[PDB]
Amino acid sequence: EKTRVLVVGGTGTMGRRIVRACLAEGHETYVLQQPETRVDIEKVQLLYSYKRLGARLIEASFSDHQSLVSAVKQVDIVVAAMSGVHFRSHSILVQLKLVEAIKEAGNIKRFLPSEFGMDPSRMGHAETFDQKLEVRNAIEAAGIPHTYVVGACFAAYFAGNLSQMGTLIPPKKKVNIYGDGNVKVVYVDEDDIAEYTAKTLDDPRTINKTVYVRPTENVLTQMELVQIWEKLTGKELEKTNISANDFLADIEDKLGHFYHIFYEGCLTDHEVGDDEEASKLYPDVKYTRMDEYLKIFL
Amino acid sequence: KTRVLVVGGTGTMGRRIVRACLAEGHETYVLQQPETRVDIEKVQLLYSYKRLGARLIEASFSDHQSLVSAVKQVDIVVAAMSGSILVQLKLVEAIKEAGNIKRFLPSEFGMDPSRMETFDQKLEVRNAIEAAGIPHTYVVGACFAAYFAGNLSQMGTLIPPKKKVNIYGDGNVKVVYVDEDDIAEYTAKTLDDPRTINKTVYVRPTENVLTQMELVQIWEKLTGKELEKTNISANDFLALGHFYHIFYEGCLTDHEVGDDEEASKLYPDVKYTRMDEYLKIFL
């Protein structure tokens, strides 16, 4: 009656939260560990800390198809979390090795690919979305049941820096505001994305569906967010409004993923049913409001 | 209540010291240099310290006055380098200029550079420390278990061998194997202990003075399997560097230490991790 979950990418920013959420939810949790992590002091100490909490380590490589199928047949569900900072420009596409291994094994009840972000296929008029769309097309062709978890703006990347580029912590005097800071955004603590992911991966209501992560009180414009900050610090920030016009679309150096969120409005340009939204399907997840999220920075 | 500034608090050894200081009750400070603000792993780490009670001090190593400013906020400075050992000299000159530091522990937790390229560097740092007048403690004398024990002292890996193990020599050369968290804990009990001021403290928990063969058979008792041993002579050992002094010349226990200078006897309430227990997580 307990679900066996394999987390692929268990040592990344988002991967490690999913490993810990799956353990906190009672899942028998398996963590893919590649051959090349036996020389990496922080990856070994990280992987073996999951073991202390009950996880299991299964070694396999992505280049080695039999070790991948040998790996996914020890589990019921596969979650991939393969984007950001310990990954590469194309390691989303490496999930096609996983889909081809999952189909050969036949036992997989669900596959949750690396999707935690803007819903691609809402992005036909803008590549990250093409790699994620190609991984979905392979999932669906192979007949693997899926959940896509989408719709979130990572708080460590857009909230803790007041949506400032160039930094991950609040600025001391200035803040650039995009447009009129009037575009609604969905700032979410990545731990909440991970907890929602671990509650949904075996919920029968979400099989072969998309699950939007939009906890209501954290739907917030950028100026509403920096006003949660200004209030906490008691200090009003100097605000340069940046117009849609001012367009780095040319050969300086970076994204313009920012333009999709803070100008297009594309995280909140589509109402969500309460049968498609994570805060509503899992109301027991006391998600982190952004006034509490930011307090750690004062 | 001692205040402690931990320089290098995001390294593998620094981060254990920050947590050991906070656990002992010290008022622990960690530097956050300006290069940190784009690095997500350092940022998660640093603010995970704030959540446990530590305070961050913004400063940079190329701006002398913020280091001076940073060491004035605190009584004791512990450096732990893993990120370059000679940047402790800039630290030494700021600690001179601020004059308020009761004690400096420089980055030294490996093997003692008086037996003794990183030791010309550790000794240059010591001579700056003692030229400058700064009361000091040198915590030395240990093989970190994550580099020499979990792998049963195999090179190229950090997890134990499946079926073949290499034995250096007869494997009857005594080595000292210490969990790095006990190095951090000892480092936290010692930084303000009146007896270790201007002394050198040896981390040599007696039950973890082991030959490589004795360690390989702590593993053989846990698993109940015998590994295939290939004995590798001194001369066959050819391309650390450091493996040859530790395992063929026995550098870690040429000198027998007194109970006045050794952490497990100065602090016997520290129930250090034995290798029969450190290795359990790998089965």
Numbering used by the authors:
A (entry chain A): 8 to 133, 139 to 266, 274 to 317
B (entry chain C): 9 to 91, 98 to 130, 139 to 261, 274 to 317
From the paper:
Pinoresinol/lariciresinol reductase (PLR), an NADPH-dependent reductase, converts pinoresinol to lariciresinol and subsequently to secoisolariciresinol. Here, we present crystal structures of IiPLR1 from Isatis indigotica and pinoresinol reductases (PrRs) AtPrR1 and AtPrR2 from Arabidopsis thaliana, in the apo, substrate-bound and product-bound states. The crystal structures were captured in the apo, substrate-bound and/or product-bound forms. Each structure contains a head-to-tail homodimer, and the catalytic pocket comprises structural elements from both monomers. β4 loop covers the top of the pocket, and residue 98 from the loop governs catalytic specificity.
Several regions (α5 loop, α9-helix, and α9 loop) are partially disordered both in the IiPLR1_apo and IiPLR1_NAP structures, for which the differences can be characterized by a RMSD of 0.287 Å, whereas the β4 loop is well defined in the apo structure. Intriguingly, the β4 loop is well defined in the AtPrR1_NAP structure but disordered in the AtPrR1/2_apo structures. These structural differences suggest that the loops are somewhat flexible, and act as a switch to control the binding of NADPH and release of NADP+.
